[PDB]
Design a protein around this ligand. Sequence first.
Ligand SMILES: N[C@@H]1[C@@H](O)[C@@H](O[C@@H]2[C@@H](O)[C@H](O[C@H]3O[C@H](CO)[C@@H](O)[C@H](O)[C@H]3N)[C@@H](N)C[C@H]2N)OC[C@H]1O
Ligand SMILES: Nc1ncnc2c1ncn2[C@@H]1O[C@H](CSCC[C@H](N)C(=O)O)[C@@H](O)[C@H]1O
Ligand SMILES: [Mg+2]
Length: 307
Amino acid sequence: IVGGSTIQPERVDAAALRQLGDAMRKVVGSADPTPLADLLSGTPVDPDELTREVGADGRQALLDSGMAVDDGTTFSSPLRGHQLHGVVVLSDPDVEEEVQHRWYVDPLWEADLLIRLMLRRGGARALDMGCGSGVLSLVLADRYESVLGVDVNPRAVALSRLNAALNGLTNVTFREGDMFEPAEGRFSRIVFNSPTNEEGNEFVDLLEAGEPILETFFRNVPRKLESGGIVEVNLAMNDYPGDPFRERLADWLGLTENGLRVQIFTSQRRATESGGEWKRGWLVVAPGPVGLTEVEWPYHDRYEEDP
Ligand SMILES: N[C@@H]1[C@@H](O)[C@@H](O[C@@H]2[C@@H](O)[C@H](O[C@H]3O[C@H](CO)[C@@H](O)[C@H](O)[C@H]3N)[C@@H](N)C[C@H]2N)OC[C@H]1O
Ligand SMILES: Nc1ncnc2c1ncn2[C@@H]1O[C@H](CSCC[C@H](N)C(=O)O)[C@@H](O)[C@H]1O
Ligand SMILES: [Mg+2]
């Protein structure tokens, strides 16, 4: 089972982690097969070669944090490395649902896509709801005085702190908790790579939590959002005959009474039962004329392996 490994950033000093991060930045996500790159790709590596690359300091940092395991004559990693838009991010390997631990962290299914979708504005205070590996938070930290990442998965919170230290980022905070419970006051930016996919209304697990998690999210948005604030959400939406997602959403948001401008970009569509239709898209609340707008944009087909 994958996603249960111990993650302990507190067991390594910040300077060492930062320097590991700097070594990752050079080799992770490129074509050079260094020990480090191999390690964070799922390939076992020779510790003496790893030591050549990142030093005994680096080698010990990999082990003490849980990034690598000493299997005797080789090291392996439970984690996989990524380098996105200047940021290095470790997460779990992408594996089928049936072998995921309950504390499995989103292996960056959509994150590289989402960052390209995200508005390139900055501001005071950002919130990354369901931060998982921390990836969206790490990106937002460049632009915001302060970023708060929230997850109900304690392993995600630890992984987030690890990844922030690897990148030397210190204006980010990560908190374990349930949706908005640990998020006090208001935010100028809220990002939500929602745990919704094929489960419809049913709660399945942390990565497919059901439509009610969106209702909870959107019902609270008006009181968590600063004036002129921006909300961005990746989500699956179910339309049923006589019951479109957009109208339930409008009700949750109190869309008209709150003067929110909503724009939905629908990328993928699927047939579902009850004559329903499933869609995946990118939802943006941004300052502008009250109302909801939906447009077609097959950005999965277009980008996926691109910008
Ligand atoms: N935030 C995410 C959202 O981005 C989305 O992610 C999807 C991802 O889970 C799916 O992953 C499935 O297929 C993979 C093989 O391809 C299998 O290893 C996987 O365990 C399985 N799950 C992807 N194929 C498509 C993604 N959009 O739904 C889950 C939410 O928690
Ligand atoms: N009730 C809840 N409160 C806070 N986070 C939750 C939650 N239920 C599920 N989540 C989290 O929502 C995340 C969805 S996957 C998104 C992970 C990350 N932000 C990324 O883009 O890669 C998971 O990390 C899951 O643990
Ligand atoms: Mg699952």
